[PDB]
């Protein structure tokens, strides 16, 4: 929590709370200037609550006085905290104008709204004149700059507390908050700038949950020593596909190859295995003899044999979800002593007791529909629920990759948030590619958590490099863009 | 004084002194970043005195900690002021390293020196380890950034107090100081950035001495309404020249024409008057019949006649300095009821009682050699002596333009400093042009103080637009560049 960090910085390091508040306010001014250019022609309406968010607001307003065309503060609170009171006092001593009554027409004489109503101190739903004013701002079409967090977003979860400000720019202090990272909060934040306001760097770095950055992924990418051969870069087996789903294995297999894996084999029911090599003859696609087009216990021994000569096994894409699949997946995972990447229909039939008894590592890659069925909760209770994800990973000794527009990656100790990607990934097949990518990076020597961190980043970044409209992106095009994502990352 | 401004901002407006000090320090960090780019690879040596300049220094050092490759503070004082003490305390609590002993080799492990030894609190000559350290910094070749003023420059005068730091960059707070504007201080300041640290804008604007800026000159330039004719733009008479100095009148006359004057007449001893039109036939150059090649009382009535039909008279360039000139200049100025621009040899023979009895305005344009002879002091006592200039202007009811690399313009109430120009103006003739420019702007309707402010700026700016090496600039080329200076100003 930034709250712990503010407190320690004040009480133990000895930085006056007023100095942090001044630094906060001026970083808002500089952020606005970077975004709007010269501020001097603009008229500013600063909406201040009675808390420290409002106090930051008063610092902003005071620093604009005499330098812009107009500044007005609407003070919407009842009582003021001591720092808000101090900064209100300065704003007035410097000649600033404050009103306590809000007029619907007020928005008309201003170009920029600075939202300093509520920050991390929001508790409960917004109602009354707070709500009316936020709704009026959202209908106004003015430029909106939010202080710390858009008022109405819960900074720990990203949820909207009845209504919330939609900002063009949010300036936050020290570290991004969870509510800027998860949706709907991420959407209402608009462009996010993270300002250094003077916290010791040691405190800033000690936060246990963070955004996966380009620099983090660059330093995790495996080395490609020149004196190498395919064995240097590992082997993956993908157990995938069925009479119903002949394409999923292909997307997973190429996912492994495009991230640099040395050798990829699929095991796919015959004749569906032949589909893979008709499209990408660099893949090896082993025919598995099945009774009715689905993997079953009759195939257990062959798959365990194929697994002896690989570094990692991915299972699940396109398997189907029926009883013979369920028996195979669970007996296989119970006996397999290799890292496993478990996706799709392998999750849908997974007995989670099996994860507990496995000595080898696992990564699970559910979407929220699959996570919901796995833990027997509703989609809406698991979606963006990073605490549930953490508890699950810790209890089952795995890495959990919970896919969504912001993807959560956790082993129960460390939790990372991925924000690359766009809606071209909201289409069948995009998940099957990611499964291959993860197995691929594991085969090359990354830990399951590392492999997952790198893959979700690069997968999202590849989607963003599609040249035409994102809604037309398909999994095949995604594959082509992976090596461009890798180049641009370096 | 910034001292008055700091005090009022703390004691009457209520801004904590510590907040001003934090704002000062961070503006130094941002200024360094703007100038050096990313700071993270650099190693910083911060030299702090025991005063508030040092306290600013501690703020700088603290804010670099953990973000750059290395920071060390050498604390050189004995006692610390309360704010310096507070910020030293923060620097140490944040993990910062301070030493009190300075090693000659210390400079070797650092790339940037931040000079926070003395600011506006410097009193007396620098000696001892203060001097040794400043001399070591000046020999080091490192990048030097001075806090407020380079240590050793007297901020009220620009004089060096035995020795002073030579900076690449100076970051000053609120307003430039006189010591950044006058030499040698101007030279030791290097690039000057003026930082807003939160003083009320009303206090900042109330300073009575300032630098002539582009915006100030733009708003003073006279209007050129389309429906106009030569009479709209006034008439100048220039009384100038002699058998010795036939070229000076020409430079003055063209100076008036190039700034937009409608009509320019010279009165010059025959046959030297013919020189002007041989070079610039747009000039009118009236032949004055003289006994021996110099103006005398025999020419008084003709000149007063020529003066009836003009808006302003310039006198002095090239007149010569002998007794007949002296009698003419003084009787003429005593009887002339028009604005006068008094330069060169007219200053050298001027009886200052005449200025006192004149009802009409005057501008005087001495260089320090001429000012020295006028007030009977040494060159070194008048050079950059803006208080003497002010007292002179006030006592004689004139505008005084004291020319030097920084030119002082004053009417005794307001004093302006000009910083355009280069050493191409350090050559005979450049002054004669300026005299014409001033008379020209007066003829067009500017007050003597306004005409002088605009002219010194544009004259210096024209020198800077010379395309080849400045030492080759001559007065004729200067004239050609005036209308380009005017265009660029607009």
């Amino acid at each position: 929590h930034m709250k712990e960090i503010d407190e320690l910085t004040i009480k133990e390091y000895g930085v006056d709370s007023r100095i942090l508040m001044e630094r906060a306010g001026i970083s808002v001014v500089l952020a606005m200037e970077e975004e709007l250019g010269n501020l001097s022609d603009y008229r500013f309406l600063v909406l201040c609550g009675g808390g420290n968010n409002g106090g930051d607001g008063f610092v902003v307003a005071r620093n604009l006085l005499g330098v812009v065309k107009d500044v007005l503060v609407v003070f919407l609170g009842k009582k003021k905290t001591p720092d808000c009171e101090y900064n209100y006092g300065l704003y007035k001593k410097f000649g600033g104008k404050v009103v306590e009554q809000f007029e619907p027409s007020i928005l008309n004489e201003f170009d920029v709204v600075v939202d300093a109503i509520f920050g991390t101190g929001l508790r409960g739903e917004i109602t009354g004149e707070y709500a009316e004013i936020i709704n009026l701002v959202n209908k106004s079409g003015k430029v909106v700059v939010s202080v710390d967090v858009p008022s109405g977003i819960d900074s720990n979860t990203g949820k909207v507390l009845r209504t919330a400000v939609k900002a063009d720019l949010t300036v936050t202090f020290g570290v991004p908050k969870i509510g800027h990272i998860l949706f709907p909060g991420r959407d209402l934040t608009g462009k996010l700038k993270v300002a250094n306001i003077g916290h010791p760097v040691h405190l800033i770095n000690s936060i246990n949950r963070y955004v996966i950055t380009r620099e983090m992924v660059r330093s995790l990418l495996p080395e490609r020593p020149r004196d190498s051969h395919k064995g240097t870069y590992g082997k993956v087996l993908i157990i995938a596909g069925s009479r119903l789903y002949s394409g999923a294995p292909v997307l997973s297999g190429m996912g492994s190859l495009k991230v640099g894996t040395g050798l990829v084999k699929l095991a796919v029911p015959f004749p569906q295995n032949l589909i893979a090599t008709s499209r990408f003859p660099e893949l090896i696609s082993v025919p598995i003899d099945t009774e009715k087009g689905f993997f079953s216990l009759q195939n257990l021994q062959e798959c365990l044999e194929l697994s002896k000569d690989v570094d990692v096994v991915a299972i699940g894409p396109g398997l189907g979800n029926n009883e013979h699949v369920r028996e195979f997946v669970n007996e296989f995972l119970k006996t397999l002593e290799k890292p496993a990447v478990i996706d799709a229909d392998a999750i849908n039939v997974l007995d989670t007791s099996v994860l507990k008894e496995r000595k080898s590592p696992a990564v699970l890659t559910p979407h929220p529909g699959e996570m919901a069925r796995l833990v027997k909760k509703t989609v809406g209770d698991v979606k963006y629920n990073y605490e549930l994800a953490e508890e699950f990973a810790k209890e089952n000794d795995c890495v959990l990759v919970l896919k969504s527009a912001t993807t959560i990656v956790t082993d129960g100790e460390k939790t990372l948030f991925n924000i690359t990607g766009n809606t071209g990934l909201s289409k069948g097949g995009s998940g099957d590619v990611l499964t291959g990518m993860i197995a691929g990076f594991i085969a090359q020597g990354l830990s399951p958590l590392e492999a997952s961190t790198v893959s979700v980043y690069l997968h999202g970044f590849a989607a963003e490099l599609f040249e035409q409209d994102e809604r037309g992106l398909t999994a095949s095009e995604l594959l082509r863009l992976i090596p461009e994502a890798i180049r641009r990352l370096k | 004084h910034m001292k008055e401004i700091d005090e009022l901002t703390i004691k009457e407006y209520g801004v904590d002194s510590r907040i001003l000090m934090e704002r000062a320090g961070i503006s130094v960090v941002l200024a360094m970043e703007e100038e050096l780019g990313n700071l993270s690879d650099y190693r910083f040596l911060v030299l702090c005195g025991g005063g508030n300049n040092g306290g600013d220094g501690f703020v700088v050092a603290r804010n670099l900690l953990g973000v750059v490759k290395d920071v060390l503070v050498v604390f050189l004082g004995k006692k610390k002021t309360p704010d310096c003490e507070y910020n030293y305390g923060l620097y140490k609590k944040f993990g910062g390293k301070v030493v009190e002993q300075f090693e000659p080799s210390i400079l070797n492990e650092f790339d940037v020196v931040v000079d926070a030894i003395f600011g506006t609190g410097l009193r007396g000559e620098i000696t001892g380890e203060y001097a040794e350290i400043i001399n070591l910094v000046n020999k080091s070749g490192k990048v030097v950034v001075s806090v407020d003023v380079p240590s050793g420059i007297d901020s009220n005068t620009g004089k060096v107090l035995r020795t002073a730091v030579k900076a690449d960059l100076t970051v000053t707070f609120g307003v430039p100081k006189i010591g950044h504007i006058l030499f040698p201080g101007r030279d030791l300041t290097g690039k000057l950035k003026v930082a807003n640290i939160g003083h009320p804008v009303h206090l900042i604007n109330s300073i009575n001495r300032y630098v002539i800026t582009r915006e100030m000159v733009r708003s003073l330039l006279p209007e050129r309404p389309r429906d106009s004719h030569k009479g709209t733009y006034g008439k100048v008479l220039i009384i100038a020249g002699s058998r010795l100095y036939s070229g000076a009148p020409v430079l003055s006359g063209m100076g008036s024409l190039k700034v937009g004057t409608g009509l320019v007449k010279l009165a010059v001893p025959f046959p030297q008057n013919l020189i002007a039109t041989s070079r610039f036939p747009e000039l009118i150059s009236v032949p004055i019949d003289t006994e021996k090649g110099f103006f005398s009382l025999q020419n008084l009535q003709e000149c007063l006649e020529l003066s009836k039909d003009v808006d302003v008279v310039a006198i002095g360039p090239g007149l010569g300095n002998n007794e007949h000139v002296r009698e003419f200049v003084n009787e003429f100025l005593k009887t002339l009821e028009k604005p006068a621009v008094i330069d060169a040899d007219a200053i050298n023979v001027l009886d200052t009682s005449v200025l006192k009895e004149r009802k009409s305005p005057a501008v005087l344009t001495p260089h320090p050699g001429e000012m020295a002879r006028l007030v009977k002091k040494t060159v070194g006592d008048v050079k950059y002596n803006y208080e003497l200039a002010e007292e002179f202007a006030k006592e004689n009811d004139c505008v005084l333009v004291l020319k030097s690399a920084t030119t002082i313009v004053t009417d005794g109430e307001k004093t302006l400093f000009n910083i355009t120009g280069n050493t191409g103006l350090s050559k005979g003739g450049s002054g004669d042009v300026l005299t014409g420019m001033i008379a020209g702007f007066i003829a067009q309707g500017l007050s003597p103080l306004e005409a002088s402010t605009v002219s010194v700026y544009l004259h210096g700016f024209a020198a800077e637009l010379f395309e080849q090496d400045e030492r080759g600039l001559t007065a004729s080329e200067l004239l050609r560049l005036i209308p380009e200076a005017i265009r660029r100003l607009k």
């Binding site: 500089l30 970077e34 996010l192 700038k193 993270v194 | 970043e33």
Partner: peptide, 6 residues
Amino acid sequence: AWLFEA
């Protein structure tokens, strides 16, 4: 980079 991260 000193003041802002994106």
